[PDB]
Design an enzyme around this catalytic site. Sequence first.
Site, PDB file in Angstrom:
ATOM      1  N   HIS A  16      81.127  -0.734  32.084  1.00  0.00           N
ATOM      2  CA  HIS A  16      80.956  -1.302  33.398  1.00  0.00           C
ATOM      3  C   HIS A  16      79.477  -1.607  33.645  1.00  0.00           C
ATOM      4  CE1 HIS A  16      82.148  -1.565  37.861  1.00  0.00           C
ATOM      5  NE2 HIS A  16      80.888  -1.953  37.759  1.00  0.00           N
TER       6      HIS A  16
ATOM      7  N   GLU B 204      74.221   0.287  43.129  1.00  0.00           N
ATOM      8  CA  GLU B 204      75.643   0.152  42.931  1.00  0.00           C
ATOM      9  C   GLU B 204      76.430   1.434  43.072  1.00  0.00           C
ATOM     10  OE1 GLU B 204      77.036  -2.685  40.066  1.00  0.00           O
ATOM     11  OE2 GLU B 204      78.554  -1.361  39.258  1.00  0.00           O
TER      12      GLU B 204
END
Lengths: 196, 196, 224, 98, 110, 110
Positions: C34, C128
Amino acid sequence: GIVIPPKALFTQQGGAYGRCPNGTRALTVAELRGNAELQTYLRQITPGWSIYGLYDGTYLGQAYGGIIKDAPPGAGFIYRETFCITTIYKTGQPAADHYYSKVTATRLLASTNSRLCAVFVRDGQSVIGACASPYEGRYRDMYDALRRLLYMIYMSGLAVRVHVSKEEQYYDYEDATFQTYALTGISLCNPAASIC
Amino acid sequence: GIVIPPQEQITQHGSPYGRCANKTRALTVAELRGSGDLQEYLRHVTRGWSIFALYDGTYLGGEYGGVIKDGTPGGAFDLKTTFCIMTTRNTGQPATDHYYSNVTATRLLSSTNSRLCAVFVRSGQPVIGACTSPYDGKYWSMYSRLRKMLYLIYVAGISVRVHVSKEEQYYDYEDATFETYALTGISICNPGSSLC
Amino acid sequence: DPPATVYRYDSRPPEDVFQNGFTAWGNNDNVLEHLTGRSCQVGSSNSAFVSTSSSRRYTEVYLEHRMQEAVEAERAGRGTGHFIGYIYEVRADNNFYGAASSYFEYVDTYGDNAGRILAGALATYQSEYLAHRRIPPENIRRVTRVYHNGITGETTTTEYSNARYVSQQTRANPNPYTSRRSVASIVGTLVRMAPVVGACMARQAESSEEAMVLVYYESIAYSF
Amino acid sequence: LPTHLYKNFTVQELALKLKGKNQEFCLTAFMSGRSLVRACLSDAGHEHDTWFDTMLGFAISAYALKSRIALTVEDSPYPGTPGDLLELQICPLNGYCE
Amino acid sequence: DVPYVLVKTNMVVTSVAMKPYEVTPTRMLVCGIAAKLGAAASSPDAHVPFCFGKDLKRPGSSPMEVMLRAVFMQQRPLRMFLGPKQLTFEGKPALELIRMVECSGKQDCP
Amino acid sequence: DVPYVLVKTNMVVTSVAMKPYEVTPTRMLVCGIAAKLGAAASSPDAHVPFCFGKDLKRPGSSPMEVMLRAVFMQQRPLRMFLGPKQLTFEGKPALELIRMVECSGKQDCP
């Protein structure tokens, strides 16, 4: 509070129509305002009824009463004489090492044949500014190495311990709350190695 | 299946503290252990109850016989003398272009005042090794450009068509299962393209 | 402290977002694929994570630039010049884990060569947070719609509140998300340019209403 | 000097080679609807031409960013041969050169 | 040329270009197109050609050239001091770029 | 100085840096911090400070610079020849790096 360019940086034969010669930069009124001696100096060197451009406002010759009137950035450039300061100042302090940790690089700035600079910031506050020119300075030869790492850390959000020599002071950023000196070393932080 | 350095690839006097000079590098065990010329050379020039350091082991010469004893990497640098191989061989062949395709640059190597090399693999197995140096070589002029293409394809994993000249041979890599010549071109290439 | 509110720029409008939140592309819950963009890559999208950012400013800037792209496209003749973008405000809970913290842990478990320096520089740069699997409508609180007429230069901000929004006193999970070592060939950090943005973030923010040019941060993070 | 311009083309091939005993780099600009535009910048012998290195780096960045470029090539007096690259422009990232 | 130095704000470098300096072969021109963030697709400040000279005798990259690279990759808002001089980029004239500080905020960049 | 040349394997550069050469102007250092995999944070191998010279009279990037960058970015484990010299980096002594070669596998990097 801002940092005030010392009277001695006042380019005698200032720029023309906002084009301060290379290495010099348009004085701001916020600056001229706070510099008592320079104002004082101005009242004596300024001939009657002459108007002078500044980055911000304008200066009205002692005939008008020595007026520092505001104006938008670059508006007073319409006028022939522009007040300019030389960006470099030799402090006199010894060339010792001074550094700041956990800072990030932001706010690039480049004149023409002058320094490339950056503002090092710790968690919001501008901590100090550093400059590097291949054109001049005690460390003019280290420019080529530095700019390359300067660039990497600016592109990445990488924390750094920055080294700086207060040997020479730089007045490139106008109306700065922070001080700007010569970049001499950069060291990506490494906590687990006694770096940041 | 290793590359054995020619007898002349050897220093007159070995070096101290494991510090093989610039442009030279320690001889391996498997390398000495596979060179008739080298062993012989040593037996005919090694006096006393003396032992010498190899990169990965030791060489008991003189009255000891001429025994090659396996060791540990840099583990015998403890000794007075380590054996050094020069890494540059002027092959004397012609400058005909030779290229290998679909290769991917892996395993970088560099050293003080010498060259930057990479092992170009294909299908997992090595294929060639190439090097660039700004300090010495017939192609020093090509360094600046080559280092750029080399970095790009290295970090991006780009397959390429590498071009080498055999006029120079190198032994910078230890125990090479592949030859290593002078880099002379790189092509991000289109199958059977004119630019390859 | 774990942030309670996280943001998400998106091109999807309130009528569906408020009714059905966001759902991760798939089950690949591997923290490095990711962060490295591999599980968001075109044709390898399966991250069991919904990209969000605890920084509104970050999202504002992205949008700000996506919009300018519209004006540029129009100038080139490939567009109308009109843009509509949205920034959703989200109530974070335990199912929200910090990218950075997760990355570091991953590296502090499988060793340095297991990670990729910039992949973590990014995770910090983007603030994030990773919504594992699913960020439900009951969590989306408000939204800011932005319309810009590129030709006239008009920008119209308008907020809307989601009724389904259930209130709770929660925040992001304080513990790092953990996954097994990746068993994938990772050439490097996939980022979208001008400004540099995580491929998951950038890519998850698209829909049906061209291919995104993804690039390796490593290849340009240094001058040539 | 039949110069030409090509906007919104992509760099597909990049290559640093040796032409006889002169350095040389070339790129192939490609646009779906058409042919390949090949242009080469050769090391003019005159050691000072930072131009070579600069354009080379610039071309590497264009290749790296995957951006559409807009390039100006002159021409070579023999077809099936790359012309000389005189200017290179990197179109707005994520968009098109207008 | 232009009669005096302009000073654009909230500009973003949108495209960059390298070209041979039409005159002196020891120099080249690094040109680009700046745009005022958000402006009308048609306002004058929505497409501003600029150029600056690069000395080919000096190795490396000038401070301008390095910043120019960063702010383009990142699209950072800048204050640009353009003019008076006018170089020729892409046929049309273009203002010489003589300085350029990144914007901190609404304060220095309105 | 350290007594002799050290050879550390599975080293991973975790930080890089630059600083001027204390004794000389025409040169500067480039330094780093390597870490051997497996080693505990307590272990001294958990963070080996290195450095190497760069001649400021020859513009460009040395091969060790180019390599360092690539391996740093890529987090490539290495085999480094450190010593026998010591230079000062971040107030402490650091081993001069005279050579480094990326690891292939457990064979050359045990």
